[PDB]
């Protein structure tokens, strides 16, 4: 029922937070956290 | 508007003039409300209570009980003066006489003015 | 087969010999047919239609044979006649002897112990029957029985203390009371006992009701018979209370019983479903028990009188309080203590015993004996005292707080908005129209509510259809699976203004909102939505759909659950916005989005807001998702309601000689011209009479004396006495100038003496009512009255009001042939021009403009003929200067010379020879030439009189201001429809519209309230109505105003016109008695319905009315049509009645006539049902089609849609075979019998309609001729009576006819060939 990202049975396209629904081809290289900790800025 | 003023004077000369005057007051000021209350004192009662309700909503402040007094022409209008006093002096007593010392009433008026509180106590 | 076989054996009509009366038939039918079928409506209908009451029940009724079954059977029949709207009392009027015995025993039965000999349903039937009686006091036979139930002696049913209280209150009553007690002494013991029982009936009936009411459980199951008894009882209470003769003494009785307090505390009203109708009826009763009228004087109570009544009650309560109990309450000012809240505060804490004691001191209850406990509940005692003394808001304040739009809480409530399925078995919470009303407020409010609720029904149909088509589905949001022409999804909605209330009123003076729609639609629909204009009413709708996507809708199922209907609110278009944000040389907007600014009902807004603020209800105005528009012509309800409310608010100043008649009481003849104090002695009848012979013949009962003996000198003035002698003075029309063509047009109609009585009456002050049967010259009478008033009273203005624009076209057509200046004519309307000249505001402004040009040119020509220099053209202004300075001066000098004396000097000193060169004196005598000179001056003066009137067009540039001048000042005759009058009353009053005389046509086609409204299109003058005359012309024996939902007719008689009510009331009428448009033979089919309706000479004597119809032996026939392929009447869709056998026969006859050479256009085809209309059309196209030898009939339509219309030949199909249907309404019959000038041919199941008692005077004539069509296919100059010089063949059925026409046509296709392409 929700119709927004906020909120299988639904039988709707729903994308719940931010999974992209249109092509972007974005450059960004995935930020990563390892095990417990850190954004792997190295 | 000057023609409306002269016509208002013509209504002042006088039922139709009363209509022109009541329309002049209802046109949309507390002194003018006193004037319309004077019109209630002259012309004509529940409708006067309604216009008085309009004057009351316009300004809940102490002559309104006297405006209610026209409806008594009085114990009930004085009761309205009493309830208005609860909603806020001598006016309720005047309503009591209508149902039927001025110096102390005057010091009371000094109390009615909008160590000072101690004076209100004295 | 049982009831019908009995009917055939014992009482059925058209059966020569019957078995003798047998009481067991009555006993058996009642027990086994009526009671056992649970009073099945179809059984009761069959009995009633078979004439059970007229032919078996009543004429065999006597005291010796009277039984329960007998009494009940009579009441069932009478009740059913009311349900069917046919005359209910005729057989009792025929044999009145045993009615008093019968009536008294109805009373006994009604009071019979509950669940005793009579069941509760049976006693409900008796309640309804008695309701009909009280509603029928105009019938002497009924009134003479009911009098004793409702007169002053009924007060012996009062508590003794209350009686004394009333006699002290009205001391003059006691002597009448004493007189009653004295006359009672002169009675023998049984007559005394009977009198006392009658006097106590209503008060005892109330006690029976109260005990029935109390037997209703709060939550446990209840039998419907108890509910319905209580409902019908309140219906009876309302009617008794809403009629002054029944209210006068009974109102006190009802109050003494405390019925209303019992009812509001009852378990029944507390049952939300079971008691809902009871509650709504209760609210109506409450309105009347507290109605603002003096019971004894019959006058409406003023505001001061109301206040005094309320103050006196408190005062007497305080007196009792002070002396015996409540000390603080007793000493307080009235306003302190008189609110419901204050009263509960003061009396709520008291014990039951104390409250009983208080009530006893007010004579409301008997004394509570010392040390006894009261038997009454504390809540009863409290509510008794509180409701009696609390502040009440007035009827006007109550009205002014009513929203003008229906909400979802009203639209689907079938207690107040019944469907067309309403049988008439239960009652409705609706006002009733009959004869009388209490006051003007009562009268106006009944019409207000009936109009309000009836219009709500059409709204529901509009809503259910358009919203269903949109297919609202769940998506928790809404998605619309379909589209609708009349409704759009709302894209945005915002309240943009909530204005402050006027002083006193508690609602905003104005609420506005912006509503946006997206016109993503077909351009036709885009145009229609953009076609919305100011004052157009739309509805704002909230759906929260219940169904998943794709779910089918079923219109048979409850609409609200189907679409998830939550809210309905009305609104009124102010205007569409433009791209500059301005409320709308209209612009071309871009895109598909459109925003409208609208007005919301301020009372509805306040209630919703109050509900939100006080009770946490959601804001309705943030939820709308649909907006629906309507057809403009069906959507005037809000404006009419507003106008009526405004009329109610005003002092409603109608003529004092009209007020009582309007309310339906007092002398119905008191406004007749012979009883008006300002009756005019001498009248100029002008061109009314064609000769002195015509005049003498116009007054059969009078002696005519002429003021001049010379027969060559014999227009006429007539002086009436104040005694059978009329003084007639011939006079000469003043010469109008030297152009003989400027002599006036003249009336050519040789009016009958009856038509003359109408014209005479219309010229006099007062109320003139004219009953004009089909073709009796209503229109000629009307324009002659208008013309006579025009000439006799030049200052006076006449308002003409009709129902249709057709009638207006007819009036103006005939007006044009009379001596009436077209500058004095005006026609208002919101239309295809059908008259030779244009009398709209537009046409009249244009005439004035064009006439001004021509007249200013005449002034220029006059200037030059006088040798006055000046090249400038004249204006109306300088023309005026010219008249006084150049024209009047010359004339005055001239008159000074020749009128202060030879024939020669009349011409020698005549100042205007050159101007009239294009046209003078005869030189015979002074008197002649002088008058010729006078006429020349009148000619010139008329030019300048007109120019002075036309100056306004120089001072007012816009066509709208120019039209205002014509409406307010220039016109002397102003015409419009009653519809237009209702819509425009507000504007007309604001303009200062004035008029002296009203004439109406089609008066019996106009709704009651739409007849009343034209009386008040102006302000009072010096405190009185300016209205001098009211002329109404109509025919109550023809069809009534159209009520879309006939449930409002069945229960409320909402179709009844004011005209019809006045005739019923007994207002004297002038009954036109000579028709001039149809054969005398055809006239017989309906002239039985009227008073002495015969035929005019030209109908009697002209050849065109005695010439037979070619190929048909008879000029009219009723043709029996049995089954075709096993079917008679059919119903392919519900209520879409058809009859293939009849239709095919009718079409075949039409073809037969066309093949004979009839002018196809001179034939029209009529039927009583729309289903048959479409079927006949269907057959016309599928059988005639592309046939060169066969044209099309002028119309194929229903009888109801052919009112006021006619053709030479009418083919009529009655369709029905199972039941008679709405043709039983004799008015529909009369219209159906009178649409033909020369030929009427009717196709029906003859047996069905023969059995109908009301239709007998027509059908007994129709069956005097064969029921098989007599044709003469080889045929004209044959006359109506002469034996034909051809073969007469008899067609015995439709298939034989369809055969014949086929063969006839196939012979004509081979022998002829015509050629249209």
- Chain B: closest CA distance from residue C307 (Å): 9
Closest CA to C309 of C295, C330, C323: C295
Breaks in chain C after (C-N > 2.5 angstroms): 325, 475, 584, 714, 722, 830, 900, 919, 1275
Residue C1210 backbone phi and psi in degrees, to 5: -120, 130
**Sequence-distant (≥ 6) Cβ neighbours of residue C771 within 8 angstroms:** C1034, C1035, C1036, C1037, C1063, C1069, C1070, C1071, C1072, C1090, C1091
Question: Are C1231 and C1039 within 8 A, CB to CB?
Answer: yes
Q: Is C477 on the interface with A (CB under 8 A)?
A: yes
Q: How far apart are CA C737 and CA C770, in angstroms?
A: 38
Q: For residue C283, count other CB atoms closer than 10 A to its CB.
A: 12
Would you tell me which residues 662-721 of chain C have a C-beta closer than 8 angstroms to some C-beta of chain A?
none
The β-bridge relationship of strands C716-719 and C682-686 is antiparallel
Query: Residues C769, C1032: contact at Cβ < 8 Å?
Result: yes
* Burial of C1285 from C-beta contacts in 10 A (0-12 / 13-18 / 19+): exposed
What torsion, rounded to 10 degrees, do the Cα atoms C1131, C1133, C1135, C1138 define?
-40
Q: Which DSSP letter does residue C521 get? A: S
User: Closest by alpha carbon to C544, among C466, C473, C481, C459?
Assistant: C473
Query: Cα–Cα distance between C702 and C727 in angstroms, integer?
Result: 10
Chain B's closest residue to C503, CA to CA, is B54
Which residues of chain B make contact with C338, given a CB cutoff of 8 A? 76
Do residues C247 and C295 touch, judged by C-beta distance below 8 A? yes
Residues of chain C with Cβ-Cβ distance to A1 below 8 Å are 476
A18's CB contacts (< 8 A; 6+ apart) are A5
Contacts 24+ apart (CB under 8 A), C838-847: C839/C812, C839/C975, C841/C959, C841/C963, C841/C966, C841/C967, C842/C959, C842/C963, C844/C963, C844/C966, C844/C971, C845/C953, C845/C959, C845/C962, C845/C963, C845/C966, C847/C822, C847/C823
Residue C294 corresponds to which tokens in the numbers above? 């003096």
Q: Please provide the distance, in angstroms rounded to a whole number, between the alpha carbons at the two ends of chain B.
A: 51
CA B66/CA B80 separation, integer angstroms: 9
Nearest CA in chain C to A11: C475
Tell me the torsion sign for CA atoms C297, C301, C305, C311: positive
Tokens of A32: 């990563």
**Which pair of tokens denotes residue C857?**
């040119």
Q: Which of B53, B54, B78 sits opposite C333 (nearest CB)?
A: B78
Torsion of CA C209, C212, C218, C224, to 10 degrees: -100
Strand C593-600 relative to strand C682-686: parallel, antiparallel, unpaired?
unpaired
Give the number of C-alpha atoms closer than 13 A to the C-alpha of residue C27, restricted to the C-beta side: 7
Q: What is the dihedral of CA C214, C218, C222, C225, to 10 degrees?
A: 40
Token pair 């009456």: residue: C761
Please compute, for residue C774, the number of CA atoms within 13 A of its CA located in the half-sphere on the CB side.
31
Handedness of CA C1188, C1190, C1195, C1197 (dihedral sign): negative
Determine the 3-state secondary structure of C565 from DSSP: strand
Phi first, then psi, for residue C445 (nearest 5°) are: -70, -40
**Can you tell me the distance from the alpha carbon of C283 to that of C264, in angstroms, rounded to the nearest whole number?**
10
Q: Which of C298, C544, C556 is nearest to C421 (CA)?
A: C556
For chain C, the straight-line distance linking the first and the last C-alpha, in angstroms and rounded, comes to 58
Q: Which residues pair with A33 in a beta bridge?
A: A39
Closest CA to C257 of C295, C200, C195, C318: C200
Q: Neighbouring chains of A at 3+ CB pairs within 8 Å?
A: C
Helix (H, G, I), strand (E, B) or coil at C497: strand
Q: How many angstroms away from the CA of C515 is the closest CA of chain B?
A: 30
Q: Do chains B and A touch (3 or more CB pairs under 8 A)?
A: no
The two tokens of residue C653 are 């100043």
Query: φ and ψ at C1029, to 5 degrees?
Result: -140, 145
Q: Do C503 and B54 touch (CB under 8 A)?
A: yes
Cβ partners under 8 Å of residue C261, min gap 6: C380, C383, C384, C387
Say how far apart CA C886 and CA C891 lie, in whole Å. Answer: 9
CB contact at 8 A, C1246 and C1267: yes
Give the pair of three-digit tokens for residue C708: 């001049």
Cβ contact C493:C516 at 8 Å:
yes
Q: C716 pairs with which residues across the strands? A: C686, C730
Set of chain A residues whose Cβ sits within 8 Å of the Cβ of C475? 3
Distance CA B54, CA C1078 (A): 68
Give B100's strand partners.
none
Alpha-carbon span C1152 to C1166, nearest angstrom: 17
Longest C-alpha distance within chain A, in Å? 43
| C1196: nearest Cα among C1211, C1214, C1215 | C1211
Q: Which of C646, C631, C662, C639 is nearest to C1044 (CA)?
A: C631
Contacts of C476 in chain A (CB under 8 A): 1
Please identify among residues 1264-1283 of chain C the ones whose CB lies closer than 8 Å to any CB of chain A.
none
Smallest Cβ distance to B79: which of C335, C503, C504? C335
Dist CA C1098 CA C298 (whole Å): 53
Nearest to C303 among B46, B74, B78 (CB): B46
- The pair phi, psi for residue C726, each rounded to 5°, is -110, 130
CA distance C796 to C1026: 10
Which helix (H) or strand (E) segment holds residue C191: the answer is helix C189-199
At C513 the three-state DSSP class reads strand
Task: Please name the residues in contact with C391: beta carbons below 8 A apart, sequence gap of 6 or more.
Answer: C310, C338, C339, C340
* Sign for the pseudo-dihedral over CA of C1020, C1024, C1025, C1027: negative
Cited resolution, angstroms: 5.1
Q: Which two tokens stand for residue C685?
A: 């009848």
CB pairs under 8 A between B and C: 46
3-state class of C365 per DSSP?
coil
User: Measured between CB atoms, which of C304, C307, C502 is closest to B26?
Assistant: C502
CB < 8 Å from C in window 9-28 of B:
26, 28
C1272 touches C1111 (CB < 8 A): yes
**Nearest-5° Cα angle at C987, C983 to C988:** 95
Interhelix angle for C352-361 vs C378-389, to 10°?
Answer: 40
State chain C's maximal CA–CA distance in angstroms.
118
Classify residue C48 by its DSSP letter: H
For residue C538, give the nearest of C507, C575, C579 by alpha carbon: C575
> Which of C425, C468, C491 shows the shortest CA–CA distance to C563?
C468
Per the CB < 8 A criterion, the answer to whether C1003 and C1027 are in contact is no
Q: Which residue of A has its CA nearest to C476?
A: A1
Contact residues on chain B for C332, CB-CB shorter than 8 A: 75, 79
| Closest residue in C to A10 (Cα–Cα) | C475
Rg (CA), chain C: 36
A3 interaction partners in chain C (CB closer than 8 Å) = 475, 477
Interface test mutation site (partner B, options C504, C510, C649, C650, max chain B beta carbons within 10 A): C504
Q: Which residue has the tokens 């009883």?
A: C675
For C798, the 3-state DSSP assignment is strand
Question: How many CA atoms are closer than 13 Å to the CA of C611, on its beta-carbon side?
Answer: 11
Kindly compute the dihedral angle of the four CA atoms of residues C1001, C1004, C1005, C1009, in this order, to the nearest 10 degrees: 100
- Asked if C468 contacts C461 with a C-beta cutoff of 8 angstroms, the reply is no
C1050 burial (CB, 10 Å; 0-12 / 13-18 / 19+) is buried
- Nearest to C138, CA basis, from C1258, C1063, C975: C1063
* Residue given tokens 């425009």 in the structure block: C984
Whether residues C332 and B75 touch (CB distance < 8 A) is answered with: yes
Residue C732: left if φ>0, alpha if ψ -120 to 50, beta else—which one?
beta
Number of cross-chain residue pairs from A and C with Cβ atoms under 8 Å apart: 3
Whole-angstrom Cα Rg for chain A: 15
- Please list every residue in chain C whose beta carbon sits closer than 8 Å to the beta carbon of residue A4: none
Quickly list H helices, C727-875: 753-763, 778-792, 805-815, 841-865
Q: How many CA atoms lie within 13 A of C360 on its CB side?
A: 15
Contact indicator for C959, C966 with CB cutoff of 8 Å: no
**Residue in B67, A36, B53 with CA at minimum distance from that of residue C503:** B53
Measured in angstroms, the CA of B109 and the nearest CA of chain C are apart by: 25
Q: Which chain C residues have a beta carbon less than 8 Å from that of B79?
A: 332-333, 335-336
Contact call for residues C487 and C466 (beta carbons, < 8 A)? yes
What is the maximum alpha-carbon separation in chain B? 55
Cα distance between residue C636 and residue C984, in whole Å? 11
> Tokens 């507290």 label which residue?
C290
Ramachandran angles phi, psi of C862, nearest 5°: -65, -45
Q: What angle do CA B10, B14, B16 make, to 5 degrees?
A: 80
Look up residue C1115 and give its two tokens: 């000029």
* Token digits of residue C675: 């009883």
Per DSSP, C1107 falls in state B
Please choose, from the candidates C491, C470, C513, the residue with its C-alpha nearest in 3D space to the C-alpha of residue C591.
Answer: C491
The total number of residues shown for chain B amounts to: 122
Which residues between 102 and 121 in chain B have a beta carbon less than 8 angstroms from any beta carbon of chain C? Answer: none
From chain C, the residues in CB contact with A9 under 8 A are none
| Contact status, residue C828 vs residue C975, Cβ threshold 8 Å | yes
Give me C32's structure tokens.
């086994």
Q: Are C680 and C717 in contact (CB under 8 A)?
A: no
Locate all alpha helices (DSSP H) within C35-119, ordered by sequence: 41-49, 52, 68-83, 90-94, 99-111
Name the residue facing C503 among B51, B76, B99 (closest C-beta).
Answer: B51
Q: CA-CA-CA-CA torsion for C750, C755, C761, C763, nearest 10 degrees?
A: -30
3-state SS track over C322-338? HHHCCHHHHHCCHHHHC
DSSP annotation string for B3-53: HHHHHHHHHHH--HHHHHHHHHHHT--HHHHHHHHHHHHH---TTHHHHHH
Q: Identify the helix (H) or strand (E) that includes residue C1289.
A: strand C1289-1291
Q: Is residue C1183 left, alpha or beta, with left meaning phi > 0 and alpha meaning psi from -120 to 50?
A: alpha
- Coil/strand/helix, residue C495: strand
DSSP C1017-1060: SS--BTTB----EEEEEE-TTSPPPP-SSTHHHHHH-TT-BHHH
Q: How are beta strands C1029-1034 and C725-730 bridged, if at all?
A: unpaired
Pull the structure tokens for residue C560. 């609200």
| CB-CB contact of C764 with C740 (8 Å) | no
Q: Does B50 touch chain C (CB under 8 A)?
A: yes
Tokens of C159: 């508590």
Closest chain C residue to B25 measured between Cα atoms?
A: C503
CB proximity list for C136: less than 8 A, separation 6 or greater: C88, C89, C142
Q: Do B45 and C394 touch (CB under 8 A)?
A: no
Confirm if C1276 and C1110 have CB atoms less than 8 A apart.
yes
Kindly list the partner chains of chain B, i.e. chains with 3 or more CB atom pairs below 8 Å: C
Provide the annotated binding site of C for ATP. Answer: 750, 755, 775-780
Specify the DSSP class assigned to residue C34.
I
Q: For testing the chain B interface, which of C333, C339, C395 should be mutated: the one with the most B CBs within 10 Å? A: C333
Whole-angstrom distance, CA of residue B23 vs CA of residue B31: 16
Nearest Cα residue in chain C from A12: C475
Does the CB of A1 have a partner CB in chain C at under 8 Å? yes
| Spatial distance between the Cα atoms of B25 and B13, rounded to a whole number of angstroms | 16
């Amino acid at each position: 029922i929700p119709r927004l990202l906020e909120d299988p049975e639904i039988h709707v396209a729903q994308y719940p937070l931010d999974m992209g629904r249109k092509k972007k081809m974005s450059n960004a290289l995935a930020i990563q956290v390892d095990s417990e900790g850190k954004i792997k800025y190295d | 508007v000057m023609t409306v003023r002269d016509f208002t004077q013509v209504f002042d000369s006088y039922e139709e003039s009363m209509i022109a005057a009541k329309m002049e007051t209802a046109s949309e000021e507390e002194e003018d409300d006193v004037d319309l209350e004077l019109r209630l004192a002259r012309f004509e009662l529940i409708s006067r209570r309604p216009l008085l309700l309009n004057s009351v909503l316009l300004r809940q402040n102490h002559h309104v009980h006297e405006w209610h007094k026209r409806v008594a022409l009085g114990r009930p209008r004085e009761i309205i003066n009493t309830y208005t006093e609860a909603v806020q002096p001598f006016k309720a007593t005047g309503k009591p006489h209508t149902l039927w010392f001025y110096e102390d009433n005057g010091q009371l008026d000094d109390a009615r003015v909008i160590a000072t509180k101690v004076n209100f106590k004295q | 087969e049982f009831v019908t076989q009995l009917a055939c054996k014992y009482w059925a009509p058209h059966i020569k010999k019957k078995s003798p009366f047998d009481i067991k038939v009555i006993e058996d039918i009642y027990e086994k047919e009526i009671v056992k079928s649970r009073f099945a409506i179809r059984k009761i209908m069959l009995l009633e239609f078979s004439q059970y009451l007229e032919n078996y029940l009543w004429m065999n009724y006597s005291p010796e044979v009277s039984s329960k079954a007998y009494l009940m059977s009579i009441c069932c029949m009478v009740n059913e006649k009311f349900r069917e709207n046919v005359p209910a009392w005729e057989i009792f009027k025929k044999k009145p002897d045993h009615f008093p015995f019968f009536f008294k025993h109805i009373l006994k039965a009604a009071l019979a112990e509950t669940d005793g000999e009579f069941s509760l349903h049976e006693q409900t039937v008796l309640l309804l029957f008695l309701d009909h009686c009280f509603n029928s006091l105009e019938v002497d036979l009924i009134r003479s029985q009911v009098q004793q139930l409702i007169s002053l002696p009924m007060w012996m049913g009062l508590q003794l203390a209350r009686l004394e209280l009333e006699l002290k209150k009205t001391p003059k009553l006691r002597k009448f009371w004493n007189l009653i007690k004295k006359n009672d002494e002169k009675m023998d013991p049984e007559a005394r006992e009977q009198a006392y029982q009658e006097r106590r009936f209503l008060s005892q009936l109330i006690q029976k009701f109260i005990s029935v009411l109390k037997s209703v459980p709060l939550s446990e199951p209840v039998t419907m018979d108890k509910v319905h008894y209580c409902e019908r009882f309140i219906e009876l209470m309302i009617d008794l209370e809403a009629l002054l003769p029944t209210r006068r003494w009974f109102n006190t009785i009802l109050d003494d019983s405390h019925l209303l307090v019992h009812c509001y505390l009852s378990n029944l009203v507390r049952r939300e479903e079971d008691g809902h109708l009871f509650s709504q009826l209760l609210d109506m009763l409450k309105f009347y028990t507290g109605f603002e009228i003096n019971d004894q004087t019959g006058n409406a109570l003023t505001e001061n009188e109301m206040t005094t009544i309320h103050y006196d009650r408190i005062t007497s309560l305080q007196r009792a309080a002070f002396a015996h109990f409540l000390y603080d309450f007793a000493l307080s000012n009235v306003a302190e203590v008189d609110t419901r809240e204050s009263l509960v505060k003061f009396f709520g804490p008291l014990s039951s015993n104390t409250l009983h004691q208080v009530a006893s001191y007010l004579c409301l209850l008997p004394t509570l004996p010392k040390n006894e406990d009261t038997t009454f509940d504390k809540e009863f005692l409290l509510e008794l005292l509180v409701s009696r003394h609390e502040r009440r808001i007035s009827q006007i304040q109550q009205l002014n707080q009513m929203p003008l739009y229906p909400t979802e809480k009203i639209i689907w409530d079938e207690n107040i908005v019944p469907t067309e399925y309403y049988s008439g078995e239960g009652c409705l919470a609706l006002p009733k129209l009959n004869l009388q009303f209490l006051t003007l407020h009562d009268y106006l409010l009944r019409n207000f509510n009936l109009f309000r609720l009836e219009s709500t029904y059409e709204i529901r149909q509009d809503i259910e259809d358009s919203v269903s088509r949109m297919k609202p589905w769940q998506s928790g949001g809404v998605v619309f699976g379909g589209w609708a022409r009349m409704a759009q999804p709302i894209v945005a909605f915002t309240v943009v203004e909530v204005a402050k209330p006027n002083i006193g009123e508690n609602w905003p003076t104005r609420v506005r909102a912006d509503v946006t729609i997206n016109l993503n639609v077909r351009d036709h629909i885009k145009d229609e939505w953009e076609g919305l204009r100011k004052h157009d009413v739309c509805f704002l709708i909230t759906v929260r759909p219940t169904k998943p996507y794709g779910t089918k809708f079923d219109r048979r199922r409850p609409f609200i659950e189907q679409v998830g209907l939550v809210y309905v609110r009305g609104c009124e278009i102010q205007g569409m916005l433009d791209d500059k944000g301005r409320v709308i040389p209209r612009p071309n907007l871009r895109g598909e989005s459109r925003t409208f600014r609208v007005f919301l009902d301020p009372n509805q807004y306040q209630q919703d807001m109050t509900n939100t603020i006080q009770n946490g209800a959601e804001d309705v105005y943030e939820t709308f998702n649909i907006i629906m528009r309507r057809k403009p012509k069906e959507n005037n309800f809000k404006a009419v309601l507003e106008t009526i409310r405004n009329l109610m608010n005003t002092d409603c100043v109608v003529p004092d000689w009209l007020h009582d008649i309007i309310l339906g009481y007092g002398d119905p003849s008191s406004a007749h011209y012979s009883k008006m104090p300002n009756q005019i002695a001498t009248l100029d009848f002008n061109d009314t009479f064609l000769s002195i012979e015509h005049l003498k013949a116009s007054f059969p009962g009078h002696n005519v004396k002429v003021t001049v003996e010379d027969p060559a000198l014999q227009p006429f003035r007539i002086t009436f006495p104040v005694a059978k002698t009329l003084i007639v003075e011939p006079h000469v029309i003043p010469n109008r100038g030297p152009y003989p063509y400027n002599q006036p047009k003249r009336n050519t109609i040789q009016f009958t003496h009856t038509q003359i009585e109408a014209i005479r009456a219309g010229m006099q002050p007062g109320l003139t009512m004219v009953v004009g049967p089909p073709g009796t010259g209503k229109t000629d009478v009307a324009v002659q009255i208008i013309s006579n008033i025009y000439h006799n009273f030049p200052e006076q203005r006449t308002l003409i009001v009709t129902h249709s624009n057709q009638a207006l076209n007819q009036l103006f057509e005939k007006i044009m042939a009379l001596d009436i200046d077209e500058r004095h004519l005006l026609r208002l309307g919101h239309e295809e021009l059908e008259t030779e000249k244009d009398f709209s505001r537009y046409g009249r402004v244009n005439y004035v403009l064009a006439r001004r040009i021509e007249l200013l040119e005449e002034v220029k020509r006059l200037q030059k003929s006088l040798g006055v220099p000046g090249d400038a053209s004249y204006t109306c202004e300088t023309a005026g200067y010219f008249f006084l300075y150049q024209v009047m001066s010359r004339w005055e000098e001239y008159i000074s010379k020749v009128k202060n004396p030879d024939v020669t000097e009349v011409s020698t000193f005549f100042p205007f020879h050159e101007y009239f060169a294009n046209a003078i004196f005869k030189g015979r005598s002074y008197e002649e030439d002088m008058e010729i000179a006078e006429g020349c001056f009148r000619h010139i003066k008329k030019i300048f009189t007109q120019l002075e009137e036309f100056r306004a067009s120089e001072l007012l540039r816009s066509g709208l201001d120019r039209s205002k001048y014509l409406l307010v000042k220039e016109a002397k005759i102003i015409a419009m429809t009653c519809t237009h009058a209702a819509l425009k009353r507000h504007d007309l009053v604001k303009l200062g519209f004035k008029y002296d005389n009203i004439l109406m046509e089609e008066a019996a086609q106009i709704l009651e309230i739409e007849t009343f409204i034209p009386l008040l299109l102006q302000n009072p003058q010096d405190g009185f109505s300016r209205l001098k005359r009211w002329i109404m012309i109509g025919d109550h024996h023809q069809l009534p105003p159209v009520i879309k939902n006939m449930a409002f007719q069945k229960y409320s008689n909402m179709e009844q016109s004011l005209f019809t009510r006045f005739v019923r009331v007994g207002v004297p009428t002038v009954d036109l008695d000579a028709q001039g448009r149809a054969r005398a033979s055809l006239c017989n089919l309906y002239n039985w319905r009227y008073k002495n309706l015969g035929n005019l000479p030209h109908v009697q004597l002209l050849p065109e009315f005695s010439t037979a119809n070619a190929g048909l032996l008879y000029d009219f026939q009723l043709i029996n049509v049995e089954d075709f392929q096993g079917v008679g009447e059919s119903e392919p869709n519900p209520y879409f009645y058809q009859n293939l056998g009849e239709a095919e026969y009718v079409v075949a006859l039409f073809m037969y006539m066309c093949l004979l050479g009839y002018p196809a256009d001179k034939i029209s085809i009529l039927t009583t049902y729309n289903g048959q209309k479409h079927l006949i059309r269907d057959i016309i196209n599928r059988r005639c089609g592309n046939n060169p030898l066969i044209g099309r009939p002028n119309k194929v339509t229903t009888v109801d849609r052919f009112q006021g219309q006619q053709n030479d030949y009418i083919l009529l199909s009655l369709v029905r075979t199972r039941a008679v249907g709405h043709l039983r309404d004799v008015r529909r019959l009369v219209v159906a019998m009178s649409r033909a000038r020369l030929g009427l041919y009717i196709f029906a199941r003859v047996s069905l309609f023969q059995n109908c008692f009301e239709l007998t005077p027509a059908f007994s004539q129709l069956t005097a001729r064969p029921l098989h069509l007599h044709i003469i296919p080889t045929e004209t100059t044959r006359k109506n009576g002469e034996r034909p010089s051809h073969e007469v063949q008899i067609i015995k059925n439709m298939p034989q006819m369809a055969n014949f026409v086929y063969n006839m046509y196939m012979h004509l296709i081979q022998t002829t060939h015509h050629y249209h392409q």
